[PDB]
Each structure stands twice: as C-alpha cells, then as structure tokens.
C-alpha cells in the first residue's frame, strides 16, 4: 500500500546455514508464484532474473537497477518504469543506461538489476475521477492532500 | 610511378568547391571555394572563378608535393538538384592545365535510394 507496483516475495536457501531466508523484489511483469528466479552472474536472460549489467547485452531492458555495487535497488523501481542498457564501457567496467526520465547515466557493470519491466504499467492511464478516490490513494502515503492554493491564504 | 592525390569536385548551383587531398582523405591541402577569388558574389559558380581558384589550388599543392591527382566528381544531391554545377568543367580543365598530371575519375554524388520530402512545397517552387 502506497506503491502501485505489486511486490514479489521470493525465498532462497542461505548458503551458510540450513534455513530459508526471504527477500522481496518489486515484481516484474510476467512472473508467477512458483516460477523459479535465477540470480547473479551466470543467470539466464529470462524475465525475472537479476544479472549484473556487464553480463547483459545492449538494448536490454532491466529494472530496479542499483546505482552502484550492492545498494539493493535504486532506479526504475516505480510501477511500469524500466531502464534500457544502451552500451558497455568495458574498460573501467561501467555501462551506459537509459533512465525513465530520459537522462543518461554511467554506472558499474557489477551493479545488478532485475530483467523486464515493472508491473502495474498504465496505472495513471485511468482518471482518478472523484476526490474520494484521490483521498483514498493519499491517506496510505502521507498527509500532502488536499492542497490549499497559496494565492487563497 | 609517382606520388598521387584526389580532388573531389563538389560543384553546385551558386557555388563551386574543389579541394585536393591526400590518398587517405583526411589530410587536406588547399580548400578554395567559389567566392574566394572573385568578389561579385552572384558569380560564385561562374567559369572564371572556378578556373582562377583551380590554379591557386595547384599553387599551394605544388608547395608541399603533389604531381598526379584523381578527380572524383560530386553534386549537392540527395533531395536537391543531383546534377553537376556550372564551374566543375571550369575547374577540371584549369587544374589539368596548371602543372599536374591527371589520374582516374568517377561520380560520387549523394544519390538517395529515395529519401525525405524535397524542399519547396507540393504545388512547387514558382518564380
């Protein structure tokens, strides 16, 4: 609640002890309960997996991409949005990427990011329609609604 | 068995350009436009400008080391005209006279495989 993109509760086996430690990504569009999710360096380029940015080609669509190595999500984490890796800079291992604003960025290839779009795209296509709906949206976010116009006060 | 060059004659309507270069391409020697020599400025593509500047090119060209020169020929092309300008022949004969030997020639106009809307309007340019 307070984030139109639906979440994805994933569960891996911890390497260093007998137990199931759980993680929670922002769900990428086209994943299903009990689909496997492969992660890391030699993972496949199938929707849902979390590969380093050196390992992907160019023209590749990922989301939830880290700003730098091991910050655990940073960019393109909104409902519908996504990044496009648009070429390597293989020396001093960076990669040049297309952020959802439009503006570009240069970030480490060791920064992981998850493959695909994010779910709940075309959220804002519908009108919010009546004040009530807006209220309902905002009361699960914070108290920055409604807004009195400065020129009135 | 002597040193060579390449000319690349870009002769358009209302200006002439013939700049001899090295065999690679990037190493240029003398640019010489249509409007450099004569200062009338409606005679930019005229014969007498193009014959004048063509010798001037060979002057600066002899000053480094050029004996022979290929003469590739170009126009504005693409959307526009795509037919050689008036001063190209003026250049060719002039440079052929002034000192140099003459290597091979061919056409290198930017001829489209159809591309974009042409400048003017649909009903066209009229007077």
């Amino acid at each position: 609640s307070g984030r139109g993109a639906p979440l994805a509760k994933v569960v891996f086996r911890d390497p260093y002890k007998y137990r199931l430690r759980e993680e929670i990504f922002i769900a990428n569009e086209g994943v299903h309960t009990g689909q496997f999710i492969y992660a890391g360096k030699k993972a496949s380029l199938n929707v849902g997996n979390v590969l380093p940015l050196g390992s992907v080609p160019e023209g590749t669509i990922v989301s939830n991409v880290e700003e730098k190595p091991g910050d655990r999500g940073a960019l393109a984490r909104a409902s519908g949005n996504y990044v496009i890796i648009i070429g390597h800079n293989p020396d001093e291992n960076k990669t040049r990427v297309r952020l959802p604003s439009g503006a570009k960025k240069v970030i480490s290839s060791d920064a992981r990011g998850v493959i695909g779009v994010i779910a709940g795209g075309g959220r804002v296509d519908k009108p919010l329609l009546k004040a009530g709906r807006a209220f309902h949206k905002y009361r699960l976010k914070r108290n920055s609604w409604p807004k009195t116009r400065g020129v009135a006060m | 068995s002597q040193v060579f060059g390449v000319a690349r004659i870009y002769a358009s309507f209302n200006d002439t350009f013939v700049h001899v270069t090295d065999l690679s391409g990037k190493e240029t020697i003398a640019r010489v436009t249509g409007g450099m020599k004569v200062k009338a400025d409606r005679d930019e593509s005229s014969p007498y400008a193009a014959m004048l500047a063509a010798q001037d090119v060979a002057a600066k060209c002899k000053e480094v080391g050029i004996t022979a020169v290929h003469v590739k020929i170009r126009a504005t092309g693409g959307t526009r005209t795509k037919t050689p300008g008036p001063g190209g022949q003026a250049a060719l004969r002039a440079l052929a006279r002034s000192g140099l030997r003459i290597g091979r020639i061919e056409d290198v106009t930017p001829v489209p495989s159809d591309s974009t809307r042409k400048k003017g309007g649909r009903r066209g340019r009229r007077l």
Binding site: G4, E29, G34, L45, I61, G80, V117, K126, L129, K130 | -
Partner: protein, 91 residues
C-alpha cells in the same frame, strides 16, 4: 431489454464527472473487470485482486501483470526483445 445505450458499466457514475472522462474510464473499467484466460490451466478464470496482481480462480497461480490488463503493450514487446536478445549469446 438492453438496458442502456452507450455508458454501459460507467452508468454507475451517472450524470457526473463529464462525458469524456466517463468514456475514458469505461475504456479501462471493461478491461479491469474482464475475466481473462489463464496461460497455465487454459480456462477463463484470471481476474485481478489489486492492480498489478492477476489471479487464477482454478489452478491458483498468480501472475504479476499490468495495471488494468494482464499483459500491457509495453510488456509484451519487452519479452519479445529479450527473447530475441537471448539468441545472440546462446544460439
């Protein structure tokens, strides 16, 4: 009989909010309350419980989908791109 002419599902809003807005909404509300077909069990049993989440009524799989449809346009193309981009690395 056939109950209304054009509003359809948006006639719940009735007289209000402007026509263009009503129609605009209707465009989606049909898709929002559509029963879609499952990719797994192959019956007309997929619905949504909150925008983004798409449930199978039998089978009981849950797919992460679009706001108002299961496979939004942009998503559909992305997979194809990736599907194609996997055939330069492997085969």
């Amino acid at each position: 009989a056939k109950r209304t002419k054009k509003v359809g599902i948006t006639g719940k809003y009735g007289v209000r909010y402007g026509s263009s807005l009503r129609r605009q909404v209707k465009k989606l509300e049909i898709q929002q309350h559509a029963r879609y077909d499952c990719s797994f069990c192959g019956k007309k049993t997929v619905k949504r419980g909150a925008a983004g989440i798409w449930t199978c009524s039998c089978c009981k799989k849950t797919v992460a989908g679009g706001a108002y449809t299961v496979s939004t346009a942009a998503a559909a193309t992305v997979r194809s791109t990736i599907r194609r981009l996997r055939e330069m690395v492997e085969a």
